[PDB]
Amino acid sequence: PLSSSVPSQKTYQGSYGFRLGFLHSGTAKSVTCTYSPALNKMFCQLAKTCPVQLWVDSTPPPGTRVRAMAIYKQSQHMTEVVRRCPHHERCSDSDGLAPPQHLIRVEGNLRVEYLDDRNTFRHSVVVPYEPPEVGSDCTTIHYNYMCNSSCMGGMNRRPILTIITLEDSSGNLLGRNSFEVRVCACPGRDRRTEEENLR
Ligand SMILES: [Zn+2]
Numbered sequence: 001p002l003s004s005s006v007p008s009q010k011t012y013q014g015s016y017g018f019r020l021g022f023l024h025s026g027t028a029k030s031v032t033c034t035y036s037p038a039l040n041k042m043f044c045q046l047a048k049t050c051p052v053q054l055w056v057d058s059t060p061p062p063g064t065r066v067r068a069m070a071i072y073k074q075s076q077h078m079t080e081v082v083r084r085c086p087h088h089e090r091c092s093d094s095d096g097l098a099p100p101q102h103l104i105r106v107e108g109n110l111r112v113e114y115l116d117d118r119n120t121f122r123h124s125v126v127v128p129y130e131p132p133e134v135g136s137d138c139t140t141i142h143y144n145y146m147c148n149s150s151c152m153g154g155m156n157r158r159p160i161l162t163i164i165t166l167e168d169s170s171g172n173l174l175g176r177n178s179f180e181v182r183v184c185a186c187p188g189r190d191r192r193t194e195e196e197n198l199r
Pocket of ligand 1 (some may be wrong): 085086087088146147148151154183
């Protein structure tokens with residue numbers, strides 16, 4: 001439906017120095033997920049792994065959680081809840097955990113939680129924060145987008161952002177960053193073209 005609210009998209013690094021990182025994968029036609037620093041935009045395939053890295057200068061307490069949420073980028077669509085198209089809503093798609101209409105899933109984590117906000121109508125997915133490996137600099141979450149940017153009845157060629165928030169056990173904001181996302185068939189190919197846009 002239509003949300004009444006619009007989520008905040010402002011970058012906020014906060015106490016813990018919270019930032020996002022991405023694999024630098026290139027644009028070889030074979031790559032399924034590649035990020036463009038120029039456009040601050042992730043190019044990913046339908047249902048393929050999209051790794052997103054959490055980087056903190058300071059370790060947040062335990063019980064901290066990581067939420068991901070999609071919104072439309074253009075002003076005239078902001079109040080519209082990003083949601084899978086009817087075809088992929090009805091698809092034999094289920095991973096056993098995720099609601100059939102959420103765009104964003106997390107793979108590899110039985111502690112995942114999915115939320116239909118009963119006041120705003122917004123979809124989000126939440127996982128526990130885990131500190132990096134001893135000897136790693138970052139935490140990695142594997143995200144899946146289950147509906148193409150092309151799908152009419154869904155996003156229908158309108159751009160989206162993903163909003164990653166850091167929250168504490170009670171849900172208070174600890175930090176926030178964001179990136180654009182396009183779910184296509186040719187991520188390597190469509191990034192180099194869009195990076196060719198710009199110049
Ligand atoms: Zn779809």
